Amino acid sequence: TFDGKRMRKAVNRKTIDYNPSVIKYLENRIWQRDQRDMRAIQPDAGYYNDLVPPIGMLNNPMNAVTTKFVRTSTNKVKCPVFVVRWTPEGRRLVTGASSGEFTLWNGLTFNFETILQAHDSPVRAMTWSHNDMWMLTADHGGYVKYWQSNMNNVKMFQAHKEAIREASFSPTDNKFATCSDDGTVRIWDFLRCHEERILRGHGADVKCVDWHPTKGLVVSGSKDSQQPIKFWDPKTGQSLATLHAHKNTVMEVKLNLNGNWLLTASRDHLCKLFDIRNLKEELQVFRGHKKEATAVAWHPVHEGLFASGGSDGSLLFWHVGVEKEVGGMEMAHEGMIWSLAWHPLGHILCSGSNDHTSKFWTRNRPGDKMRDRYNLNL
């Protein structure tokens, strides 16, 4: 058993510390005016001082192509992790497993901090707020819990009679939307736990929900090939649009924080950009996932780039304006990637398999050789 009561030896820990990078940028940005003023991080291991976080190099977003492996983070009960979030302080990392546990993993140095028995069902959804206040979760059972920053259990309520698969949140603490496997998107009142409205007319089980950061748009994705992507209108309840995008089973749908770009993972080996103000045409598609693309996460301080999971555990990195992918791990993260979550500083990325593990991914260090088993197996 594991209860913190038996003694273990003293150990130094694998540290990915952003503090020597963030301090460096503060010293920089005084005498830096742009990125065209920045001193170059020459490729050698001696230039470990000159790293700035990705806010320092807004230009050149290939900074945050996090292919350097850090740490497999596995539990002692070996359940496959589904959702992964960082605390918006960048302090820890709550992670959802099939037995309904929230293992809070550390941030600068990763250890473990506590276990929870949160859900009676496999966890399926996890989002924080725009302030750090409230965390939203959801599961296979239909129960949605509110969580604080100290992970207090708040009043829980059966939001759905069948398995929720997402929950995203309005630009406030007032409104959010959960889609489930009954096929509906139900938009919720935050405080009253009151069922505002049901967005029917969808056809089959909808497994993702997004909310547009300003305009109040609920975007969804579907297994139903007839009604795959629906925009919605949260105050009225009417179907605003319908976008026929994918041949089967749209997995995860994410909008930028700039408010224009729709991004859509799907089981036909594709990620697609849609400008949401022009649904007639189509922006670029993203080809390179040799099996199905099951997880997608936009980069926080770089609009333009995102990481894109695979059902073969393939972990790929893209960029808007760039047709083929940038980073690459194949046969490397083993299993089926369910979710990704960047650190708030966009410098270290997480993962999560259908195998029982959940690896962590920092940026490539200067002047190392990528002979690692993820990058070049030689």
Binding site: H269, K290, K324, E325, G327, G328, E330
Partner: protein
């Protein structure tokens, strides 16, 4: 014949018997992906081997790889059509009616495998199947320069296509394979055929291995009965383009001292000086 051989290998105990079970299972799972004639019979023997050792767990192990078999069984029926028309036994003859009609059935078989019946993004699985289509065609019509040329240009195309999508160590593997298919042309079957040299010369300029190129060009010059008048034009056209004007005139020095040389290199060289080095007097002299 390897299925029955592994069963013929004597193993006593329980761990060595499970070593037999592991070895026979691996060839089963590999062979039931491969398109061929009797793929319906290998799976039939696969069903009886799983049920032959454990009936209960046979219902899962057959079911877990059955969907990939149904893709393998379907494309194998698609593979029958283009292969039933081919000969696969004719000697290699340079072109002189029926021969050009055979070439069309090869160009159909090349471009159909380029059409990717096994629809996938993995260019390594795409190319090596097209490379297997190339190697079968080079047995029957190896004295044709186009089948050698469309071979390695597909590898040059697959080199820059794998250079984009992350697979960097395999990008140079097909890139040196592109020089290899060009090497097999000039060394085995087509030694006096100039065209596959220059495709192999300009491929190595595109890989920026400029020291290797002079060995390629001078290999052709050592061959006795050719016309080096064309080669000295192109071997001057390399030196000006990659190494400068003075490197070009060293080639044109070697063009004057070869008996076999005709008048066309004297036309090219004055135009190489006038159009590139912008001089009229050297072009006049």
């Amino acid at each position: 014949d390897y299925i029955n051989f592994l069963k013929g290998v004597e193993a006593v105990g329980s761990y060595a018997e499970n070593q037999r079970i592991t070895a026979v299972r691996r060839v089963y799972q590999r062979g039931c992906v491969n398109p061929m004639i009797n793929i319906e019979q290998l799976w039939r023997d696969y069903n009886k081997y799983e049920e032959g050792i454990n009936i209960h767990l046979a219902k899962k192990m057959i079911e877990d790889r059955s969907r990939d078999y149904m893709n393998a069984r379907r494309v194998a029926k698609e593979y029958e059509t283009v292969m039933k028309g081919l000969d696969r036994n004719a000697p290699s003859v340079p072109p002189q009616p029926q021969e050009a009609q055979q070439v069309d059935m090869w160009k159909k078989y090349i471009q159909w495998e380029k059409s990717n019946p096994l629809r996938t993004e993995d260019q390594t699985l795409i190319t090596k199947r097209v490379m297997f289509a190339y190697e079968q065609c080079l047995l029957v019509l190896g004295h044709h320069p186009d089948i050698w040329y469309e071979a390695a240009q597909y590898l040059e195309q697959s080199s820059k296509l794998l250079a984009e999508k992350g697979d960097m160590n395999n990008a140079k593997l097909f890139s040196d394979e592109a020089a290899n298919i060009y090497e097999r042309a000039i060394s085995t079957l087509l030694k006096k055929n100039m065209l596959l040299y220059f495709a192999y010369a300009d491929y190595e300029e595109s890989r920026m291995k400029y020291e290797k190129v002079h060995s390629i060009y001078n290999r052709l010059l050592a061959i006795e009965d050719i016309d080096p008048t064309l080669v000295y034009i192109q071997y001057m056209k390399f030196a000006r383009r990659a190494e400068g004007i003075k490197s070009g005139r060293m080639i044109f020095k070697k063009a004057r001292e070869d008996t076999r040389t005709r008048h066309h290199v004297y036309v090219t060289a004055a135009l190489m000086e006038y159009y590139c080095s912008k001089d009229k007097s050297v072009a006049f002299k």
